[PDB]
């Protein structure tokens, strides 16, 4: 049967998505 | 996340919720429809005559 799979959490290749740019410091304006 | 509109952000967030079993697959449509409603502000309040809190429903009412 054409069946859906189940999730599988793994950090095997997470390091390949970490940027190197410095974000900086900024103020915030929060709205709810 | 690389998006520039609310629709894309909502779609990606709902996909992530479905991935991690936070919500059921059949709840995606209602949540997506509710998350894309118009966002009013303080100015229109007088034109609305007051507001009261509400709760979602499966039937849409």
């Amino acid at each position: 049967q054409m069946e859906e799979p189940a999730a599988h959490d793994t950090e095997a290749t997470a390091t390949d998505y970490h940027t190197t740019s410095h974000p900086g410091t900024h103020k915030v304006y929060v709205e709810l | 996340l690389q998006e520039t509109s609310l629709a894309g952000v909502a779609n990606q967030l709902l996909d992530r919720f479905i991935f991690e079993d936070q919500i059921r697959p059949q709840d995606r449509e209602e949540l997506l429809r509710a998350l894309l409603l118009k966002h009013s502000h303080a100015g229109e309040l007088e034109a609305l005559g007051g507001v009261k809190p509400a709760v979602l429903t499966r039937s849409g009412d």
């Binding site: 390949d16 | 779609n11 996909d15």
Partner: protein, 581 residues
């Protein structure tokens, strides 16, 4: 034509200026400052300057429009690997338009100190090639000697070209091992596309690297038909990649504008025109001879003996540097451009070029066999091969026939010994004889490594004389096909479904089957899923659902891992349009 500023629109409180840039300016990070009569300098902002193929007056200028999109604005490319008989495409994510790629490239370029020359692409390309080759030599680790099949799925999987650049510049990621050292071309192409110079990665099959300028390659083979010892000075590689840059050469004589092959030397790099390699002008650039020798050279095989004396053998000619292929423009089909590097075989021009090069360089079998083998071998399967012998003599003769099968890496480095067989034949009265034998994965001494190709050698030794006949072929291992089903067109912000199909053609069931999906513009990052064991009889089928967000031509890539094999990848493209107003 120089720096200028014209007021386009004037208002009561606001002004609109239109700044112009000269067609030959230093690239890099800029800063704009304003001077009034009385007060000091005031900083307005910062911006970056890049080359452009869209300007008719620039050195890097592409006339066609589709070529501009394919060679500069594309981020999803294809790299062709495998043997010259069967070519396997691999989906690569160049990712030249990421957030930090431009900053990293400029910071790496900032180690040149000849700022004045940053206005011409030749110097920048040469410096970047040399620096990237040095970084590759510094940061690429040798393959582990220990055997680890459990972790083998994590050593050979590639997620693109930006992680490699980040790990090379900063050393804070997963390193790349010696089994995959062809990624340097992809990294260089990514950087070059980022700076604005059109580039392309080409792959040449059966290229004779190693020796510098010579036209002869020496190979030594054992008595049983295998290769005793390991390594050599100059050997024939299975394939080799090389980046090309589109530009114009002003310092060279007229007629060499176009594509330039970027060839680093083990440092100082350089780039050479293609037409120079085609014609054979060796006195134009120091690297012309080295690249010319690597595309058309002849090899000779020496047969070792127990005594130790090397003896020449009559061997069937093997082709060197053939079927050069690259990605087609505007589609996903490979195109062969071997006509831009060599003249057609058996022509007057090619033999004239060869004899001219030889003249310039000079200043400074009663029986035969032939072998028919398949172009590919199914994994954990079998295939038939045939060897035929024809003798030319009045009297009969007995011969010793030996056949060997052994693994080899993509650069000629020995991997393991797999199979050997020796037998006796007797031919009489000028009769041809055919011997067809099977080849199985159940008869191998061990399991061949992950990314290797099989080499088949056949040697026939005459009993009366000493001369022997030799032949060799290269075979690649093919893995089960992974089918993807999806509509060709999709609408934005609407659900889309994909179907994945796989069939178990192996002899043992798969376990720990894990499949991952990813794609730029369709999914945020990769997603992984598990499955149940699949028996050799039945098949595996799966369904996924997602939602496109960006418009244009996207694609998704899926990857399958299990205990029998690792990193089985496939891709599929799709076109997504904007919603109806």
């Amino acid at each position: 034509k120089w720096w200028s500023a014209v007021v386009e629109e004037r208002d009561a409180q606001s002004w609109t200026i239109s700044v112009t840039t000269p067609a030959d300016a230093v690239i890099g990070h800029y800063s704009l400052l304003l001077q009034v009569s009385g007060r000091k300098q005031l900083l307005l902002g910062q911006f970056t300057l890049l080359f452009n193929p869209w300007n008719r007056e620039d050195a890097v200028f592409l006339k066609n429009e589709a070529q501009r999109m394919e060679y500069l604005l594309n981020q999803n490319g294809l790299i062709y690997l495998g043997t010259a008989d069967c070519i396997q495409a691999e989906s690569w994510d160049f990712g030249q338009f990421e957030g930090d790629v431009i900053d990293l490239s400029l910071r790496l370029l900032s180690k040149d100190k000849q700022v004045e020359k940053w206005s011409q692409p030749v110097h920048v390309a040469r410096v970047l090639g040399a620096l990237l080759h040095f970084l590759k030599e510094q940061r690429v680790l040798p393959t582990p000697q220990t055997q680890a099949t459990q972790e083998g799925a994590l050593l050979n999987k590639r997620r693109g070209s930006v992680p490699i650049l980040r790990q090379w510049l900063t050393g804070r990621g997963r390193p790349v091992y010696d089994g995959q050292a062809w990624v340097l071309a992809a990294v260089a192409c990514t950087v070059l596309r980022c700076l604005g110079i059109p580039a392309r990665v080409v792959t040449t099959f059966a290229s004779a690297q190693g020796t510098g300028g010579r036209l002869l390659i020496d190979e030594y083979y054992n008595e049983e038909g295998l290769q005793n010892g390991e390594g050599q000075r100059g050997r024939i590689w299975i394939f080799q990649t090389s980046t090309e840059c589109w530009m114009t050469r002003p310092a060279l004589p007229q007629g060499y504008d176009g594509w330039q092959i970027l060839h680093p030397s083990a440092g100082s790099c350089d780039l050479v025109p293609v037409r120079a390699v085609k014609e054979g002008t060796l006195g134009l650039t120091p690297a012309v001879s080295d690249l010319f020798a690597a595309i058309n050279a002849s090899c000779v095989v020496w047969k070792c003996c127990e005594d130790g004396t090397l003896e020449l053998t009559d061997s069937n000619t093997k082709y060197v540097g053939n079927n050069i292929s690259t990605k087609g423009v505007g589609s996903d089909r490979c195109e062969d451009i071997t006509q831009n590097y060599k003249y057609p075989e058996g022509s007057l021009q090619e033999k004239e070029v060869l004899e001219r090069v030889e003249k310039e360089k000079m200043e400074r079998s009663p029986l035969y066999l032939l072998l028919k083998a398949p172009s590919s071998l199914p994994l954990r399967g079998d295939a038939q091969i045939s060897v035929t012998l024809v003798n030319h003599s009045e009297q009969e003769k007995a011969v010793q026939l030996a056949i060997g099968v052994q693994a080899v890496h993509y650069n000629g480095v020995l991997a393991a010994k797999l199979w050997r067989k020796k037998l006796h034949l007797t031919l009489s009265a000028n009769l041809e004889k055919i011997i067809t034998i099977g080849l199985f994965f159940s008869n191998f001494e061990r399991n061949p490594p992950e990314n290797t190709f099989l080499r088949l050698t056949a040697m026939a030794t005459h009993s009366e004389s000493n001369l022997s006949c030799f032949a060799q072929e290269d075979i690649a291992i093919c893995r089960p096909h992974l089918a993807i089903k999806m509509p060709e067109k999709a609408e934005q912000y609407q659900p889309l479904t994909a179907s994945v199909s796989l069939q178990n053609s192996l002899d043992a069931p798969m376990e720990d089957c894990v499949i991952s999906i990813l794609g730029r513009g369709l999914i945020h990052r990769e997603r992984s899923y598990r499955f149940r064991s699949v028996w050799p009889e039945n098949t595996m089928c799966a369904k996924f659902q997602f939602t496109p967000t960006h418009v244009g031509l996207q694609r998704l890539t899926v990857e399958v891992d299990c205990n029998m094999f690792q990193n089985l990848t496939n891709y599929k493209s799709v076109t997504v349009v904007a919603p109806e107003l």
